[PDB]
Amino acid sequence: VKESKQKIHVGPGELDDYYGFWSGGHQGEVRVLGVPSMRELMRIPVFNVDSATGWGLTNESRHIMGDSAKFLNGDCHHPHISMTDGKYDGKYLFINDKANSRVARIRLDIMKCDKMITVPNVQAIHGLRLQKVPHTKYVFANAEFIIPHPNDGKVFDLQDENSYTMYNAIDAETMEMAFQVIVDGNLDNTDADYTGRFAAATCYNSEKAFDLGGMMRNERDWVVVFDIHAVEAAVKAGDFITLGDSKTPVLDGRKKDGKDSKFTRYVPVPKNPHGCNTSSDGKYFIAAGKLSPTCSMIAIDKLPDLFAGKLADPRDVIVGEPELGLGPLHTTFDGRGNAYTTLFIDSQVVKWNMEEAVRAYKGEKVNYIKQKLDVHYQPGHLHASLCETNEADGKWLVALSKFSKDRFLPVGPLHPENDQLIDISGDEMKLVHDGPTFAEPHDCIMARRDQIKTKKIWDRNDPFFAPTVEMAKKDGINLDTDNKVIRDGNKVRVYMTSMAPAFGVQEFTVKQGDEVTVTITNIAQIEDVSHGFVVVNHGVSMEISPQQTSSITFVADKPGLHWYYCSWFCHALHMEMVGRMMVEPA
Amino acid sequence: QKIHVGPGELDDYYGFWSGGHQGEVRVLGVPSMRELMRIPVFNVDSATGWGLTNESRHIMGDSAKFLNGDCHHPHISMTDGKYDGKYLFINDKANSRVARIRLDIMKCDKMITVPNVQAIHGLRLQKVPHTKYVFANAEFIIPHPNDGKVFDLQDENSYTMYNAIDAETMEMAFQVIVDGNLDNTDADYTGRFAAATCYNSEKAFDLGGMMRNERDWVVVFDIHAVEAAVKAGDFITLGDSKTPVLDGRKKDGKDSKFTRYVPVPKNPHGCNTSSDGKYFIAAGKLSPTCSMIAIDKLPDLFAGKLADPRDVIVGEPELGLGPLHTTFDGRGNAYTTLFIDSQVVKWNMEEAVRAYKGEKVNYIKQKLDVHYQPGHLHASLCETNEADGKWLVALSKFSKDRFLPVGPLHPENDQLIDISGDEMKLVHDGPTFAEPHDCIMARRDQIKTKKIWDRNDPFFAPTVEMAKKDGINLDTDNKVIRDGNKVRVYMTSMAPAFGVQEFTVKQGDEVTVTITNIAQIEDVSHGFVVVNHGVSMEISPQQTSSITFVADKPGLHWYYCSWFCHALHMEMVGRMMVEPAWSHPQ
Ligand code: CUZ
Ligand code: CUZ
Ligand code: CUA
Ligand code: CUA
Ligand SMILES: [Ca+2]
Ligand SMILES: [Ca+2]
Ligand SMILES: [Cl-]
Ligand SMILES: [Cl-]
Ligand SMILES: [Cl-]
Ligand SMILES: [K+]
Ligand SMILES: [K+]
Ligand code: NA
Ligand code: NA
């Protein structure tokens, strides 16, 4: 007998217990929440263009985005925190972009996106999870959609032998591709084991169809299990191919005339399975049945025997297949031996015991279902605190529901998502908070307060703006002191320090048509004294926080006087923290 | 007074938060302070496609080239000094715009770039007899014309202008040239008078010059005189704009027909009409006071029946350091933010008026500490004669230690305060991104939203018109129209299938995809994303949306529905096949 009795109210002056990291959904950012208050503490721009900080307008952000800076949209689903020894280490957050096929990395000490990669030769990065053990060496990323190779417009057929999709491994530390694995079918969600050897992904389009009925024809698709040691062995030996102009090593994980690859095993699982979730004790890859009212439990301890050819049938690694309810999509864990699964159709979370499910699969008459909690409505992902680590603490559960209906005030034709906080600390799940969120966060991740350490002010050698320091070095500028205008043909490079309530350069003059770069270094050493910089009617906007350098480039295409001002309320004289750009006519 | 809104309870008030330099408008539930919706206005929204869609870019006009905005002041249209819930208006300081949000669909439906001005800052609505005019301050003095021959702010032709926009047509109504500059503004409860603070009576560009004079002023406008001069044809026009321009400057000590300038210390900021309609209250900022302009003495002031403009001041209470903004409980109390002292000061307006007459009386009732450095504040219904004295939001600029650390950039602290009793009670600390400057609350029953679009809605009527030229009936048709190197795809959508699941174009074709969501159910929104083309939009029930992009890459390119709509949402996809350029002419 233990009761669910956790306090939910975080009063003024009190602090939240957990950080929540929410996908921004189709809006494209990452959002930082306090838990259990469910209040949004910060937005981290990633694939969106952020007017406030200038992400997507500044030179530093467009350098990180690369050529993909041309896109103003993203679609993210799956945020995950880097691990060491199966526990969060607080270093990085990774997230996917399904719209323009990217992975981004966020540095959790500065809460900014610091690296971004377009995954080559694929369309639509969806499933994403991190190696757990010995640490996050790889980011694993699913590309969802089968495409021709090459995709040059000569072949459009999905059934062609060179039409396929690929599992992707990115080096977490360098954010360069490590390798790709061609698979049969497609890829939905993915997870990793607690040794580093195995990773697994669900597949819903084993049929390689494009139409709705075609994609639901097979009784069973599969989860494909990857032998990462075997992949690495082959890469280290040089037996791989490359595709197109990408140097990425490409391994072939497809079955060929019935024969298995060294790199993959295909475990039949019903049906168009969706979630693929590693239990916190490291025993199971759990695939959520979706169209089948089940979850399928893959025993990780049997996978070495599967890849060694010691098992008669790939189904022999299935050790449980509990019937739970209508539309199982995702599973999480309290670390006490229970699994928690969203039922999309039944609109519930079901709590169930994994070892009892395994015994029931053997034919014991034991009831493994503990509780079904109604949620509102149609839940997708769910997340129990520390569930992706061997420290899963079984305290908080968030269920992320796609139809809010009447749970909030009406706000027009478009509705918010209902992210519901559930106390799981005791024997009964208890619903304690409905949190409306914009643009469908799909999944979220929680960390203990003590797992996250942030910088209070920037470091001057920070890699985030190191290329700007370099540019200034070429101009002979000491960013910490200098207030100067460099003229270079039709290029003008203003460098200034800023200190509330004044810009260090308060006027400058240019010729109509000049390309202007303005670089600002906030030399305050006080926490929270951010400055802004907006050029009126030029579409120019950016943030400069304490000890940061930020820069932005625009063309002075309009003759005349053009004011600039500080956008971040910084000082009693903030309205007067302004300057003039004077543009002499052509 | 209920503080906490439990699961399945609804908030009692809507709150409309400015998005600050992030450029959107945010809809909150009060008192829970949870964000229910984001309304993109000057930002590019990846989720809905605002800034990318043809409908949004049509509304933005040429300003669709800007990806940024800076908004501060949201206000709800009024009829007879009460909110009518028709429209929300907000300013853009970064690119000199005013936007209108239609509160039934919670979307920006009109936008205007105010001509011949720089930086739209202060903004407020006529109250009586209804909101005919939107009043908008241009904050910065510029040359006229601003063609790069004159840069000096002291030139005869260097000034800023007060701006009146027709609320219903969102076209310019008139502009009034003023001395000095403009900061905030408000309107009386008769329709005759509006008023604006000025902090740069010096027409300087540096900090000390802008602070030189002991008093700047509140400039009062006689809208009846302006209206009479425009009907009489007595105005000029500037540049290309047909907007009537009237001259509200003093010339040679002589007052204009349209303006009177009331001396007020010092670099005053806020400008707030009391809910009883008696006073324009100006916040003294650098002066530790507010200045109360008796609106009933204004007709006498404009008729030359007063010896000194100061004679319309009937109060100047000393309140504390850095008064910025004032709001009203409707019980004769005013609440003022003290930026430097970091407090809200509650004071009795009539008692302050007696103390100005010499009658010693303590008009200050309470000073509540806020965290930290408050800017604007807002009491529920404060801008109407229905000011109800229940809730107070103070919007503080430095949150320091009030929330978990999230890096060098800190959230703001919007603190909800109970003012229903004699004593202000701090009840909730609400972190917000990008510095909302101001907000506005409305009773739940003052807002009526549509659950599904009307098919004749002007938001997409231009698109319906385009479709008619192609002979399309958007409600039923699934057709691909070809026109040279343009392709216009029209389709219906019903979960979980796109009405046109595949189409083929030539490389380089300009593709418009128009989608009509023909669902009748609430909350069934679809999305549309073209992988790797930077294309993303929302289509809510009975909406038509369209987006245009270049099919610049040969090959097969997937599109998918981004808005979780169904159990088969992962499977709602389509294919664009792009034939290579080398296989087609040129
Ligand atoms: Cu992309 S899917 Cu269940 Cu993860 Cu939301
Ligand atoms: Cu623009 S000012 Cu007190 Cu409104 Cu914030
Ligand atoms: Cu710098 Cu406001
Ligand atoms: Cu249509 Cu999801
Ligand atoms: Ca299938
Ligand atoms: Ca002044
Ligand atoms: Cl998953
Ligand atoms: Cl338990
Ligand atoms: Cl104001
Ligand atoms: K939704
Ligand atoms: K701030
Ligand atoms: Na990169
Ligand atoms: Na317009």
Q: What is the DSSP string of B509-547?
A: -EEEEEEEE---STT--EEEEETTTTEEEEE-TT-EEEE
- Residue A277 near residue A332, CB atoms below 8 Å: yes
Q: Do A210 and B501 touch (CB under 8 A)?
A: yes
B345 is a domain residue: yes
Closest CA to A413 of B180, B34, B542, B491: B542
Which ranges constitute the DSSP H helices of B401-532?
461-469
Q: Of B14, B16, B13, B15, which is closest to residue B2 (Cα–Cα)? A: B13
Q: Cα separation of A322 and A293, whole Å?
A: 8
Indicate yes or no: CB of B118 within 8 angstroms of CB of A562: yes
Distances in whole angstroms, Cα of residue A113 to Cα of each of A55, A73, A155, A463, B391: 9, 15, 37, 12, 38
Which residues, at least 6 apart from B203, have a Cβ–Cβ distance to it below 8 Å? B141, B153, B154, B158, B180, B181
* Cα–Cα dist B295/B279, whole Å: 5
Q: Distance between CA B254 and CA B248 in Å, rounded? A: 11
Report phi then psi at A450, rounded to 5: -75, 0
Question: Is the separation of the CB atoms in B538 and B527 below 8 Å?
Answer: yes
| Contact yes or no for B77/B126 (Cβ under 8 A) | no
- Say if the Cβ atoms of B555 and A151 lie within 8 Å: yes
Neighbours of ion ligand 7 (CB under 5 A): A 189, 275-276
- At position A521, the amino acid (one-letter code) is T
Of A423, A446, A465, the residue at which a domain comes to its end is A465
As given in the structure block, the two tokens for residue B148 are: 């790069």
The span from the CA of B330 to the CA of A8, in Å, is 34
SS (H, E, C) B240-308: CCCCCEEECCCECCECCCCEEEEEECCCCCCEEECCCCCEEEEECCCCCEEEEEEHHHHHHHHCCCCCC
Best interface-test mutation with B: which of A159, A521, A537 has the largest number of B CBs within 10 A?
A537
SS3 A317: helix
State how far the Cα of A544 lies from the Cα of A533, in Å rounded to an integer: 8
Angstrom distance (rounded) from CA B387 to CA B379: 8
Amino acid identity, position B229: A
Beta bridge partners of A299: A284
- Please say whether the beta carbons of B71 and B22 come within 8 A: no
Does the bond joining B346 to the residue before it have cis omega, within 30 degrees of 0? no
User: Tokens in use for B86?
Assistant: 């028709």
B229's tokens: 């001069």
Q: Which of B428, B460, B492 is the endpoint of a domain?
A: B460
Burial class (CB in 10 A: 0-12, 13-18, 19+), B439: buried
Contact B508, A100 (CB under 8 A): no
- The reply to whether A475 touches chain B by the CB within 8 Å rule is no
Which residues, other chains included, contact A318 with Cβ-Cβ below 8 Å and sequence gap of 6+? A267, A269, A296, A297, A298, A299, A361
Residue B135: closest CA among B62, B71, B73:
B73
Distance separating alpha carbons of residues B91 and B113, to the nearest angstrom: 10
Whether B32 is in a domain gets the answer yes
Residue among B57, B63, B60, B74 nearest B17 (CA): B74
Burial status of residue B280 (CB atoms within 10 A of its CB: 0-12, 13-18, 19 or more):
buried
Compute the CA torsion angle A309, A313, A318, A320 (nearest 10 deg). Answer: -140
Cis omega (within 30 of 0) for bond into A249 = no
User: Amino acid letter at B9?
Assistant: E
**Inter-chain touch B20–A52, beta carbons under 8 Å:** yes
Do residues B397 and B510 share a domain? no
State the best of B396, B570, B577, B583 to mutate against chain A, taking most chain A CBs within 10 Å.
B570
Residue A77 CA, closest ligand 1 atom number: 1
Structural contact between residues B183 and B137, judged by C-beta atoms closer than 8 angstroms: yes
- Name the residue among B375, B554, B562 with its Cβ closest to that of A152: B554
Chain A CB contacts of B496 under 8 Å are 212
Residues B317 and B185 in one domain: yes
Residue with tokens 């003059």: A509
Q: Which residues make beta-bridge pairs with A498?
A: A503, A522
* Residue from B411, B406, B418, B380 nearest B395 by CA: B411
Q: Are residues B181 and B262 in the same domain?
A: yes
Residues facing residue A340 across a β-bridge: A332, A351
Relative to the alpha carbon of A191, which ligand is closest? 7
Ligand 2 — pocket residues by CB below 6 A?
B 72-73, 121, 269, 324-325, 375-376, 437-438
The parent domain of residue A521 ranges over 466-585
* B74 neighbors B88 (Cβ within 8 angstroms): yes
Looking at the DSSP assignment, which residues form a beta bridge with residue B221?
A: B194, B259
Residue B539 alpha carbon to ligand 4 centre in Å: 10
| B27: helix, strand or coil | strand
Distance CA A343, CA A377 (A): 10
**What burial class does residue B53 get, using C-beta atoms within 10 Å of its C-beta: 0-12 exposed, 13-18 middle, 19+ buried?**
buried
Residues 34-63 of A with CB under 8 A from B: 34, 38-43, 47-54, 56-57
Residues contacting residue A142 through CB under 8 Å, at least 6 positions apart: A125, A126, A127, A128, A167, A168, A187, A188, A189, A190, A201
Show the tokens assigned to A175.
Answer: 């954010």
Q: Is A332 in contact with A350 (CB distance < 8 Å)?
A: no
Sign of CA dihedral B396, B400, B402, B403: positive
One-letter amino acid of A534: V
Collect all residues of chain B within an 8 Å Cβ-Cβ radius of residue A97.
Answer: none
**Known binding-site positions of B:** 72-73, 121, 199, 202, 210, 216, 267, 269, 325, 376, 397, 412, 437, 526, 561, 563, 565, 569, 572
Do the bridges between strand B510-517 and strand B486-494 make them parallel or antiparallel, or are there none, so unpaired? parallel
Enter the tokens of residue A276: 């693929």
Ligand lying closest to the C-alpha of residue B57 = 13
Distances (CA, A) of B358 to A401, B320, B353, B571: 63, 19, 9, 77
Tell me the resolution in Å: 1.8
- Among residues B271, B287, B290, B267, the alpha carbon closest in space to that of B196 is found at B271
Strands A221-227 and A264-269: antiparallel
Cβ atoms within 10 A of the Cβ of B465, count? 9
Give dist(CA A119, CA A116) in Å, integer.
10
DSSP code, position A481: T
For residue B49, what are its two tokens? 């496609």
Residue numbers of B between 384 and 413 with CB closer than 8 Å to A = 397-400, 402-411
Tokens of B288: 């530790």
Q: How many domains is chain B built from? A: 2
Place of tokens 């030359």: B304
Are B497 and B508 in a shared domain? yes
**What is the phi/psi pair of residue B302, to 5°?**
-80, -10
Report how far residue A398's alpha carbon sits from residue A382's, in angstroms, rounded to the nearest whole number. Answer: 5
- In a domain, residue B586? The reply is no
Q: What order do you get walking across the sheet with B107-113 strand by strand?
A: B75-79, B82-92, B97-102, B107-113
Ligand nearest to the CA of B570: 4
Q: What is the C-alpha to C-alpha distance for residues B76 and B96, in angstroms, rounded to an integer?
A: 20
Q: Cβ of B408 and A458 within 8 Å? A: yes
A530 contacts B409? CB cut-off 8 A: yes
Count of other CB atoms within 10 angstroms of residue B552: 12
Q: Is the CB of residue A563 less than 8 Å away from at least one CB of chain B?
A: yes
Coil, strand, or helix at residue B126?
coil
What CA–CA distance (Å, rounded) separates A300 from B424? Answer: 60
Calculate how far, in angstroms, residue A380's C-alpha sits from the geometric centre of ligand 1.
7
**How many beta carbons lie within 10 A of that of residue B7, not counting itself?**
15
Asked whether B81 and B384 are in contact (CB, 8 A), the reply is: yes
Residues B474 and B392 both lie in one domain: no
**What is the end-to-end Cα distance of chain B in Å, rounded?**
73
Three-class DSSP category at A316: helix
Q: What is the DSSP letter of B43?
A: S
Distance separating alpha carbons of residues B125 and A208, to the nearest angstrom? 59
DSSP at A234: H
B124, B72 contact by CB (below 8 A):
no
B95 near B66, Cβ under 8 Å? yes
CA angle centred on A124, ends A121 and A126, rounded to 5° = 125
Q: How far is A233 from chain B (nearest CA, A)?
A: 32
- CB–CB of A254/A183 below 8 Å? yes
Phi, psi for A383 (deg, rounded to 5):
-150, 120
Q: With an 8 Å Cβ cutoff, are B47 and A26 in contact?
A: yes
Question: What size, in residues, is chain A?
Answer: 586
Q: Are A586 and A511 in contact (CB under 8 A)?
A: yes
> CA-CA distance, A437 to A414, in Å (whole number)?
12
Whether A381 has a binding-site annotation, put simply, is yes
Angle at A20 between CA A19 and CA A23, to 5 degrees: 145
Do A149 and A163 contact (CB within 8 A), yes or no?
Answer: yes
Q: Are residues B299 and B387 in the same domain?
A: yes
CA of B377 to the centre of ligand 9 (A): 9
* Cα–Cα distance measured from residue A76 to residue A79, given in angstroms and rounded to the nearest whole number: 8
Residues B489 and B433 in one domain: no
d(CA A401, CA A435): 10
Give the H/E segment covering residue B491.
strand B486-494
A380 touches ligand 1 (CB under 6 Å): yes
Q: What span, in angstroms and rounded, lies between the C-alpha atoms of B229 and B244? A: 9
Secondary structure string (H, E, C) spanning A16-71: CCEEEEEECECCCCEEEEEECCCEEEEEECCCCCCCCCCCCCEHHHHHHHHHHHHC
Pairing of strands B216-222, B259-264: antiparallel
Q: Does B66 touch chain A (CB under 8 A)?
A: yes
User: How large is the greatest C-alpha to C-alpha distance in chain A, in angstroms?
Assistant: 87
Q: Please state, as a whole number, how many other Cβ atoms lie within 10 Å of the Cβ of residue A494.
A: 21
Q: Determine whether the interchain pair B8/A407 forms a contact, defined as Cβ–Cβ distance below 8 Å.
A: yes
Q: How far apart are CA A536 and CA B158, in angstroms?
A: 17
Strands of B167-252, DSSP E: 172-178, 185-187, 193-198, 216-222, 245-247
The residue to mutate among B285, B327, B339, B376, having the most atoms of ligand 2 within 8 angstroms of its beta carbon, is B376
Do the domain assignments include residue B313? yes
Instruction: Report how far residue A513's alpha carbon sits from residue A508's, in angstroms, rounded to the nearest whole number.
Output: 15
Task: Please check whether residues B452 and B469 belong to one and the same domain.
Answer: no
Atom of ligand 4 nearest to the CA of B564: 2
* Ligand number, closest to the Cα atom of B373: 11
Q: Are residues B118 and B240 in the same domain?
A: yes
What is the identity of the amino acid at B215? Answer: R
Q: What are phi and psi of B427, to 5 degrees?
A: -110, -25
Task: Give me the phi and psi of A57, to 5 degrees please.
Answer: -110, -35
Token pair 């309205």: residue: A575
Residue B249 in contact with residue B177, Cβ under 8 Å? yes
Q: Is A518 left (phi over 0), alpha (psi -120 to 50) or beta?
A: beta
Find residue A266's DSSP bridge partners. A224
Question: What order of strands is seen across the sheet that includes strand A540-544?
Answer: A507-511, A578-584, A560-565, A531-535, A540-544
Q: Which two tokens stand for residue A240?
A: 């791989």
- Secondary structure (3-state) at B445: helix
B573 DSSP β-pair partners:
B560
A297 CA to centre of own chain:
25
B260, B218 Cβ separation under 8 angstroms: no
A38 to A389, B386, B413, B511: CA distances (angstroms): 22, 33, 15, 42
Q: What is the spatial distance between Cα B96 and Cα B98, in angstroms, rounded to a whole number? A: 7
Q: Are B346 and B334 in contact (CB under 8 A)?
A: yes
Q: How far apart are CA A349 and CA A283, in angstroms?
A: 22
In terms of domains, do B500 and B438 share one?
Answer: no
Cis check: omega of the bond before A501, within 30 degrees of 0: yes
The last residue of a domain, from among A433, A465, A497: A465
Tell me the nearest-neighbour CA distance from A247 into chain B, angstroms: 20
Question: If DSSP codes are grouped into helix, strand and coil, which group holds residue A465?
Answer: helix
Answer yes or no: is A80 a known binding residue: no
B585 in any annotated domain: no
Amino acid identity, residue B503? Answer: F
Are the Cβ atoms of A438 and B35 closer than 8 angstroms?
yes
Nearby residues of B44 by Cβ (< 8 Å), 6 or more positions away: A48, A49, A72, B50, B51, B52, B67
Please report, for residues A67, A373, B119, B187, the alpha-carbon distance to residue B132 in angstroms, rounded to integers and kept in the order given.
47, 52, 22, 12
Task: Specify whether the CB–CB gap between A164 and A254 falls below 8 A.
Answer: yes
Cα(B407) to ligand 12 centroid in Å equals 23
Task: Say if the Cβ atoms of B70 and A51 lie within 8 Å.
Answer: yes
Omega of the bond prior to B372 within 30 degrees of 0, cis?
Answer: yes
Say which residues have a Cβ less than 8 Å from residue B200's Cβ, sequence separation at least 6: B141, B180, B181, B210, B216
Length of chain B: 586
Answer yes or no: is the C-beta of A531 below 6 A from any ligand 3 atom. yes
Annotated binding site of B for Ca(2+): 199, 202, 210, 216, 267, 397, 412
| A75 C-beta closer than 6 A to ligand 1 | no
In this complex, is the C-beta atom of B475 within 8 Å of any C-beta atom belonging to chain A? no
Whether the Cβ atoms of residue B443 and residue B13 lie closer than 8 Å to each other = yes
Identify whether residues A410 and A543 lie together within a single domain.
no
Asked if A335 and A274 touch (Cβ cutoff 8 Å), the reply is: no
What type of residue sits at position B90?
I
Place of tokens 């599969």: A222
* Ligand 1 contact via A442 beta carbon (within 6 Å): yes
Please give the Cα distance from B445 to B381 (Å, whole number). Answer: 13
DSSP annotation of B411 reads P
What 3-state DSSP class applies to B65? helix
Residues 102-161 of A with CB under 8 A from B: 109-112, 123-124, 145, 147-148, 150-154, 156
Contact yes or no for B147 and A585 at CB 8 A = yes
CB atoms within 10 A of CB B190: 18
Residue A132 near ligand 1, beta carbon < 6 Å: no
**Closest partner residue to A12 among B66, B398, B429, by Cβ?**
B429
Residue B51 contacts residue B57 (beta carbons within 8 Å): yes
Residue from the list A72, A402, A512 with its beta carbon closest to the beta carbon of B44 = A72
Beta-carbon separation of B536 and A152 below 8 A = no
The answer on A356 and A337 residing in a single domain is yes
